[PDB]
Design a protein around this motif. Structure first.
Motif, short mmCIF file in Angstrom:
data_model
loop_
_atom_site.label_atom_id
_atom_site.label_comp_id
_atom_site.label_asym_id
_atom_site.label_seq_id
_atom_site.Cartn_x
_atom_site.Cartn_y
_atom_site.Cartn_z
N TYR A 45 18.77 3.90 3.84
CA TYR A 45 18.31 2.74 3.11
C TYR A 45 18.23 3.00 1.62
O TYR A 45 18.09 2.06 0.84
N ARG A 50 29.14 -14.00 -13.64
CA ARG A 50 27.91 -13.58 -12.99
C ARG A 50 28.12 -12.23 -12.32
O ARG A 50 29.24 -11.76 -12.15
N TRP A 55 12.99 -6.81 2.76
CA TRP A 55 12.50 -6.67 4.13
C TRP A 55 12.29 -8.05 4.72
O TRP A 55 11.61 -8.89 4.13
N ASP A 95 0.82 -1.22 0.00
CA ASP A 95 0.00 0.00 0.00
C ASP A 95 0.85 1.26 0.00
O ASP A 95 0.34 2.32 0.37
N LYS A 96 2.12 1.19 -0.38
CA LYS A 96 3.06 2.29 -0.27
C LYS A 96 3.85 2.38 -1.57
O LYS A 96 4.43 1.39 -2.01
N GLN A 126 2.43 7.05 0.55
CA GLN A 126 1.16 6.41 0.87
C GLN A 126 0.31 6.53 -0.39
O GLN A 126 0.11 7.63 -0.89
N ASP A 128 8.74 -6.55 8.69
CA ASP A 128 8.48 -5.13 9.03
C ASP A 128 9.74 -4.32 9.37
O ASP A 128 9.75 -3.49 10.27
N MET A 129 10.81 -4.56 8.61
CA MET A 129 12.06 -3.81 8.77
C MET A 129 12.86 -3.97 7.48
O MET A 129 13.49 -5.01 7.27
N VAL A 130 12.86 -2.94 6.63
CA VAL A 130 13.65 -2.98 5.41
C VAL A 130 15.13 -2.93 5.74
O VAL A 130 15.57 -2.15 6.60
N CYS A 176 9.56 6.63 0.43
CA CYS A 176 8.33 5.86 0.52
C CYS A 176 7.13 6.77 0.75
O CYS A 176 7.23 7.81 1.39
N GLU A 202 30.44 -5.72 -2.47
CA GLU A 202 31.64 -4.89 -2.55
C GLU A 202 31.79 -4.28 -3.93
O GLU A 202 31.84 -5.00 -4.93
N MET A 215 6.96 2.87 -3.39
CA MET A 215 8.39 2.84 -3.14
C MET A 215 9.11 3.31 -4.39
O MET A 215 8.75 2.96 -5.51
N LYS A 220 11.60 10.70 2.41
CA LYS A 220 11.94 9.91 3.58
C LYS A 220 13.43 9.62 3.60
O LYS A 220 14.20 10.29 2.92
N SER A 221 13.82 8.63 4.41
CA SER A 221 15.21 8.38 4.79
C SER A 221 16.12 8.10 3.61
O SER A 221 15.68 7.81 2.50
#
Lengths: 29, 158, 52, 158, 52, 29
Positions: free
Chosen positions: D57, D134, D142, D29-30, D63, D145-147, D61, D153, D32, D53-54
């Motif tokens: 990460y 490769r 995620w 529902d968001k 709504q 409930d934590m992305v 994000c 490297e 991204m 937002k932040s």
């Protein structure tokens, strides 16, 4: 003089007190 | 079982004057090479590399360059009691002690990895001790993020 | 001045015995392709800040 | 495996002057969208939206509106070691590191989701680093409930 | 009056450092489609009163 | 004056005492 030679005189025996315990553990494993 | 052919992409010969003594393998993302086996590995951009490490495990571990991350093998950490294989035959793992037939190893065949089935590297051959009809290996495996070398009674280093 | 020199030959020895015990306790964690166990990140100042 | 066609209902092009740089996906529902990819997304009622937002990460994000709740995809949080798929081929998940064939990604293909089997979105492609034959992905998955974004490297952002 | 001004430039700084620590501790919980862990509802005054 | 500059002087070092600990945790994860 006792305060100076009791601080780092007491630091040194704590530095050995770690290394005797660490070589007691990670020689065993 | 045909996938022992891919060891040539992740192996190099190391010579001391012109003769081959061992092999510097390329497991995961770190060059591993047994600390006893001397000389200069036959690769220029892998030569200039400061990687002298511990000797209680008898390893000498490095960090591989960025343009050779895709020439590496695949590491794993679990092993059941089964049937594993390396270049000079087929081995088995019984009770925490790899065994080979007697005479399949020669003094100068260190650095040889051991694959499981999927071409996943398990450990590094670096020793051997003649029990008789069979002989067991000295070997450097890792259980989970902690290498532990195993050594039977009275070995010698190949 | 000898007491001014017996300090530096007794403050380096207690600093030498921490660098050795720092080395021997986390030398296998640098050899494997693995992590650092972040409790020992807190106690010992480890060179994997998070890398390698 | 035909159900990669439904990404067009939950994707939008974002342009900076007239050229497409990335994609603002519509998981759950968001909205991204990767924080590096700039411009204005090609949708009016999704433009006027305060959602900055932040940046630790690298996400941005939002709504989603109420009249577009039914144009969204389906999110999930579990992933086994298997065979996943996105728009430019088919990937696999081994040891917490998605890998693609080399060259299937181009600089400008961020915001692409990754489906599992049922058309359930797992993560968001936003990077890449050439290992050789490769290449692995930088990716924002995620766990629950934590992305947590993952970065190998020496990557670069597409 | 400078002491009457060194209060407001030292009572805003300790209020600025709570809004930053309120932000950084629960910023991933607003990005995912997920819940708030209601212990942190009690301690930190979270904007999801229960919504989003 | 010491009571005034010891209250919000002691409030400020507790506000840093949170933010040193929070950035020690949620940089790690």
């Amino acid at each position: 003089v006792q305060r100076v030679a009791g601080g780092l005189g007491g630091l040194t025996l704590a530095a050995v007190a770690v290394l005797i315990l660490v070589t007691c553990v990670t020689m065993r494993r | 079982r045909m996938c022992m052919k891919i060891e040539n992409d992740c192996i190099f010969e190391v010579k001391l004057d012109g003769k081959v003594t061992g092999y510097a393998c390329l497991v995961g993302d770190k060059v591993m090479k047994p600390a006893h086996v001397k000389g200069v590995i036959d690769n220029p951009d892998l030569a200039k590399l400061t990687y002298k490490k511990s000797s209680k495990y008898d390893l000498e571990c490095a960090q591989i360059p960025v343009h050779m991350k895709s020439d590496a093998s695949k590491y794993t950490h679990e092993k059941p009691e089964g049937h594993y294989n390396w270049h000079h035959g087929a081995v088995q793992y019984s009770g925490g002690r790899f065994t080979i037939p007697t005479g399949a190893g020669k003094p100068g065949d260190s650095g040889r990895p051991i694959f499981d089935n999927k071409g996943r590297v398990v450990a590094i051959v670096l020793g051997g001790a003649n029990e008789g009809a069979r002989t067991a290996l000295s070997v450097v495996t890792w259980t989970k993020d902690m290498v532990t070398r195993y050594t039977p009674e009275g070995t010698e280093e190949w | 001045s000898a007491a001014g020199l017996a300090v530096v030959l007794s403050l380096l020895a207690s600093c030498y015995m921490f660098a050795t015990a720092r080395r021997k306790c986390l030398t296998p964690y640098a050899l494997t392709p693995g992590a650092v166990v972040p409790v020992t990140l807190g106690v010992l100042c480890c060179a994997p800040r998070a890398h390698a």
